Amino acid sequence: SIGLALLLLLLALLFWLYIVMSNWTGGALLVLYSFALMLIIIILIIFIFRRDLLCPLGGLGLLLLMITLLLIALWNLHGQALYLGIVLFIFGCLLVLGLWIYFLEILWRLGATIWQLLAFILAFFLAIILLIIALYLQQNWWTLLVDLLWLLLFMAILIWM
Amino acid sequence: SIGLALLLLLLALLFWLYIVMSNWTGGALLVLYSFALMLIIIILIIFIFRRDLLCPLGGLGLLLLMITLLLIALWNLHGQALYLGIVLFIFGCLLVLGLWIYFLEILWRLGATIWQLLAFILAFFLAIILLIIALYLQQNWWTLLVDLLWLLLFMAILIWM
Amino acid sequence: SIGLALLLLLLALLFWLYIVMSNWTGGALLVLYSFALMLIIIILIIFIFRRDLLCPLGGLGLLLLMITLLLIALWNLHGQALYLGIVLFIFGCLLVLGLWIYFLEILWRLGATIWQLLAFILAFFLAIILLIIALYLQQNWWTLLVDLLWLLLFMAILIWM
Amino acid sequence: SIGLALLLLLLALLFWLYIVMSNWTGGALLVLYSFALMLIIIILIIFIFRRDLLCPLGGLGLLLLMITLLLIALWNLHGQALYLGIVLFIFGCLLVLGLWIYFLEILWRLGATIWQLLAFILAFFLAIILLIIALYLQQNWWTLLVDLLWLLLFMAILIWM
Amino acid sequence: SIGLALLLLLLALLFWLYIVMSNWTGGALLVLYSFALMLIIIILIIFIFRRDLLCPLGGLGLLLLMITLLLIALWNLHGQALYLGIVLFIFGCLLVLGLWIYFLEILWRLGATIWQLLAFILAFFLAIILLIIALYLQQNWWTLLVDLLWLLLFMAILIWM
Amino acid sequence: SIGLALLLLLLALLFWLYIVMSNWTGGALLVLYSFALMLIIIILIIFIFRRDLLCPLGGLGLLLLMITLLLIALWNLHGQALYLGIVLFIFGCLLVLGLWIYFLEILWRLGATIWQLLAFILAFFLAIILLIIALYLQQNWWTLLVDLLWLLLFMAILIWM
Numbered sequence: 001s002i003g004l005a006l007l008l009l010l011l012a013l014l015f016w017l018y019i020v021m022s023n024w025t026g027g028a029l030l031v032l033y034s035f036a037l038m039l040i041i042i043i044l045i046i047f048i049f050r051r052d053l054l055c056p057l058g059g060l061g062l063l064l065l066m067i068t069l070l071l072i073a074l075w076n077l078h079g080q081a082l083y084l085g086i087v088l089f090i091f092g093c094l095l096v097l098g099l100w101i102y103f104l105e106i107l108w109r110l111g112a113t114i115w116q117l118l119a120f121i122l123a124f125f126l127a128i129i130l131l132i133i134a135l136y137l138q139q140n141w142w143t144l145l146v147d148l149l150w151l152l153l154f155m156a157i158l159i160w161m
Numbered sequence: 162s163i164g165l166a167l168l169l170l171l172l173a174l175l176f177w178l179y180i181v182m183s184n185w186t187g188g189a190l191l192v193l194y195s196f197a198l199m200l201i202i203i204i205l206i207i208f209i210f211r212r213d214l215l216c217p218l219g220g221l222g223l224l225l226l227m228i229t230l231l232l233i234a235l236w237n238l239h240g241q242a243l244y245l246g247i248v249l250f251i252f253g254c255l256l257v258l259g260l261w262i263y264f265l266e267i268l269w270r271l272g273a274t275i276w277q278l279l280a281f282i283l284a285f286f287l288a289i290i291l292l293i294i295a296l297y298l299q300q301n302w303w304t305l306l307v308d309l310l311w312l313l314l315f316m317a318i319l320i321w322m
Numbered sequence: 323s324i325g326l327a328l329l330l331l332l333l334a335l336l337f338w339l340y341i342v343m344s345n346w347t348g349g350a351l352l353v354l355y356s357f358a359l360m361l362i363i364i365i366l367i368i369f370i371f372r373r374d375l376l377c378p379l380g381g382l383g384l385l386l387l388m389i390t391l392l393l394i395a396l397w398n399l400h401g402q403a404l405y406l407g408i409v410l411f412i413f414g415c416l417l418v419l420g421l422w423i424y425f426l427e428i429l430w431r432l433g434a435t436i437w438q439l440l441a442f443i444l445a446f447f448l449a450i451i452l453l454i455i456a457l458y459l460q461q462n463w464w465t466l467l468v469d470l471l472w473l474l475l476f477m478a479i480l481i482w483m
Numbered sequence: 484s485i486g487l488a489l490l491l492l493l494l495a496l497l498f499w500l501y502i503v504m505s506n507w508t509g510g511a512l513l514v515l516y517s518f519a520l521m522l523i524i525i526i527l528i529i530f531i532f533r534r535d536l537l538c539p540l541g542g543l544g545l546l547l548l549m550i551t552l553l554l555i556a557l558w559n560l561h562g563q564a565l566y567l568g569i570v571l572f573i574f575g576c577l578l579v580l581g582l583w584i585y586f587l588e589i590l591w592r593l594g595a596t597i598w599q600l601l602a603f604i605l606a607f608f609l610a611i612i613l614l615i616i617a618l619y620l621q622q623n624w625w626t627l628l629v630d631l632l633w634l635l636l637f638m639a640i641l642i643w644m
Numbered sequence: 645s646i647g648l649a650l651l652l653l654l655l656a657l658l659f660w661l662y663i664v665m666s667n668w669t670g671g672a673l674l675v676l677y678s679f680a681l682m683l684i685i686i687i688l689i690i691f692i693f694r695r696d697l698l699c700p701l702g703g704l705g706l707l708l709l710m711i712t713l714l715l716i717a718l719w720n721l722h723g724q725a726l727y728l729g730i731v732l733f734i735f736g737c738l739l740v741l742g743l744w745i746y747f748l749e750i751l752w753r754l755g756a757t758i759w760q761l762l763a764f765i766l767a768f769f770l771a772i773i774l775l776i777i778a779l780y781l782q783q784n785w786w787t788l789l790v791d792l793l794w795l796l797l798f799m800a801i802l803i804w805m
Numbered sequence: 806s807i808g809l810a811l812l813l814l815l816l817a818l819l820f821w822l823y824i825v826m827s828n829w830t831g832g833a834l835l836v837l838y839s840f841a842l843m844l845i846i847i848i849l850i851i852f853i854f855r856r857d858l859l860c861p862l863g864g865l866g867l868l869l870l871m872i873t874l875l876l877i878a879l880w881n882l883h884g885q886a887l888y889l890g891i892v893l894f895i896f897g898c899l900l901v902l903g904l905w906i907y908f909l910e911i912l913w914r915l916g917a918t919i920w921q922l923l924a925f926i927l928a929f930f931l932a933i934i935l936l937i938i939a940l941y942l943q944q945n946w947w948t949l950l951v952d953l954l955w956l957l958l959f960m961a962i963l964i965w966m
Contacts, residue, residue: 021666021886024885062201077183080622241669301405302408330545352559359552365545391523407501413494424487652864659871680874698859729823
């Protein structure tokens with residue numbers, strides 16, 4: 001159980017980091033490929049530690065994974081299919097905001113201070129802005145930092161509890 | 162818990178079917194996107210039903226997901242990076258065969274007949290050959306069938322037990 | 323409840339009689355629309371006369387209505403979308419056959435001679451063949467006969483049970 | 484029985500989502516096809532949740548379905564048959580308005596506030612206007628949006644009761 | 645302490661992975677850098693698993709590390725300093741062979757079979773030949789393969805004991 | 806155990822003395838190689854004189870060795886790979902600073918005057934600055950002084966504890 005999970009995590013990290021160095025000065029899709037494997041890594045970490053938290057955080061990670069796959073698929077579309085995929089991505093973005101609000105409410109019910117709540121909201125929105133900047137800048141030295149800061153953000157949680 | 166999982170499954174199925182009907186006569190990368198979407202769906206289905214089986218089958222599904230992401234990343238590479246990604250994909254393939262052998266041994270220890278063991282081996286290898294054919298044929302009517310037969314294969318399991 | 327249902331039935335028969343001899347020169351699309359309205363009549367007939375049989379028979383009527391709507395969307399759709407549409411239409415037809423087999427099994431469990439069961443099977447397949455030849459015979463008089471035969475078949479299957 | 488209904492609802496969802504993106508820059512007929520399968524979705528949701536409510540609300544769903552099929556038939560017609568269809572569609576609209584006000588009065592008898600009644604009336608009329616503008620605006624974007632908004636409108640009902 | 649060692653091992657893996665694919669069509673110096681990083685991986689693994697085995701095995705790892713660093717220094721040199729470095733590297737090779745045969749004799753004293761002894765000797769010499777051919781074959785493919793094969797060879801040790 | 810360790814130490818000192826005055830004209834790469842070998846000596850010194858301090862001090866020595874190897878791979882690497890290499894080098898330097906802070910905290914807990922702690926901090930930063938200026942001063946005589954100062958600093962930190 002534990003050994004298999006660590007082996008899978010090693011594979012995930014290896015594949016991710018290789019994808020990060022693959023195709024220097026590559027396209028914008030590389031950032032999405034790296035972010036998707038970061039999401040897989042985070043899902044594996046939530047599976048390994050605090051297995052009881054697989055519902056909120058695992059759902060959040062898998063939802064972000066689906067959103068990234070949708071973005072990869074609709075990136076190159078140049079028609080009504082692009083608009084329809086945009087509308088599906090909007091639905092996914094509203095529902096991930098809803099799940100984040102639900103998780104935030106559970107954390108507040110646990111008894112966290114309002115300052116921690118605001119810090120978590122600012123951290124998540126800063127991570128989203130950071131990923132947007134990573135998409136705009138096809139550079140790999142910044143994609144590595146974005147992905148590792150996302151990993152740190154999703155690792156600080158599940159350790160707070 | 163259950164409602165959130167069904168909502169996530171609905172999103173996953175919606176995103177998968179849209180991606181399948183996106184970009185008629187599209188590239189070969191579409192098949193990989195649809196297959197990855199189904200791997201997320203199958204992860205969700207194993208999560209919903211028989212939660213105790215999330216270790217072998219969930220690990221198998223997440224491993225196939227990483228393999229597909231690696232294939233998407235290395236598809237366009239035309240250098241030593243392509244060969245290195247091929248060597249990483251070979252490692253992933255050997256380890257997926259190892260995990261399948263482990264799962265097959267657990268099933269045999271449960272007390273299944275040798276005919277069922279051979280049927281499962283043939284079903285999995287037929288699914289792999291199907292996916293190869295789906296990659297070769299960029300056609301969507303066949304990607305639908307290949308991915309749905311993969312879904313049926315991974316749904317028959319976790320119902321046998 | 324009875325008054326509303328009878329009003330809907332009268333409205334359905336009026337609409338269907340209007341639509342059958344509506345254009346006098348339209349193609350198979352008019353045949354499909356008339357067949358869909360006939361399926362709606364059938365569903366109303368089960369809901370009013372017998373009831374409590376919505377799942378076995380009304381479910382089949384609504385399934386055939388979905389199949390007819392998908393067929394309507396499938397016509398004059400030259401291109402690769404027609405292929406995936408054919409795949410989904412085949413899936414729906416397989417579901418129709420499966421339900422029919424389930425209802426046959428229920429009828430056999432209730433107790434019926436094999437000759438009479440074969441009579442129902444032959445009647446259903448003959449109705450399907452009539453509909454198929456009606457799609458190629460757009461004289462707006464054979465459609466009426468096919469729809470009347472469908473009504474009579476469903477009335478008989480409702481009254482014999 | 485319930486599982487059959489769920490499988491039928493899944494097939495209906497697949498059919499609707501395919502029809503929505505069958506072809507791009509499609510006519511209003513595609514909008515009507517998508518709306519008809521949404522009405523089928525509504526009927527299967529009502530049957531799945533509470534089978535006692537299919538008298539007023541199932542009748543309403545079948546009535547809108549029947550009206551949409553009339554509209555589909557009318558699009559092709561251009562002669563005196565078009566005028567007769569317009570008159571008959573006006574009769575159908577009067578009957579649907581009668582059923583809607585009957586259901587509204589039943590809801591008020593249940594003890595609903597006047598503000599809630601006005602909100603429901605406004606939501607229904609806004610949904611109708613949205614469907615009309617989606618018929619005017621021949622896009623797969625607005626069509627899908629109006630379909631899910633109709634789904635949410637029918638989700639506000641069948642839940643409050 | 646143990647967590648610090650694990651974090652150091654993770655950083656070492658990141659560093660090695662990166663160096664392996666720093667640039668494409670790189671010289672033998674990149675192969676030596678990757679091999680040095682693998683030797684550091686070996687030392688971390690030995691320290692993490694059992695700290696009592698760092699006398700023979702840790703010395704062996706440090707000795708191969710030191711030898712690799714000599715080779716890296718020697719590649720640039722071409723004069724009499726190259727000859728002196730060749731002599732000093734020959735001394736290092738004699739000393740590493742002496743440690744290896746000392747460890748082999750200790751293993752035999754533990755009660756290992758002659759066949760296992762010959763197999764271990766052959767595996768070590770095959771790994772050395774593979775490293776030599778990877779030096780000859782300046783590719784990031786074979787380099788990574790030889791590095792993981794050396795990792796597996798050192799995994800056969802530290803596990804049997 | 807002592808004999809092998811002393812033999813390795815003699816080999817290390819001979820290797821390093823050879824490598825410092827090896828080329829007489831080589832650039833900063835020779836400085837980096839000598840510093841790496843000088844660090845290997847340090848690790849051997851920790852393993853032989855005091856022992857039981859491998860995690861605090863030997864871990865720092867091996868971490869600095871990884872940093873030096875990454876720096877060696879970083880040189881003459883013009884391009885975008887140098888940027889991700891800088892990112893990883895910054896991560897390793899941050900880990901070095903963190904370990905140093907942890908060891909400082911351990912030393913303070915053991916009990917030491919703030920002036921002497923500041924003396925160690927100033928000595929370490931002065932050694933880092935000496936190494937930095939040595940990379941830019943490739944006269945092959947300043948490297949010897951920097952390495953001797955590093956050896957003396959580690960001797961003092963080992964003997965004072």
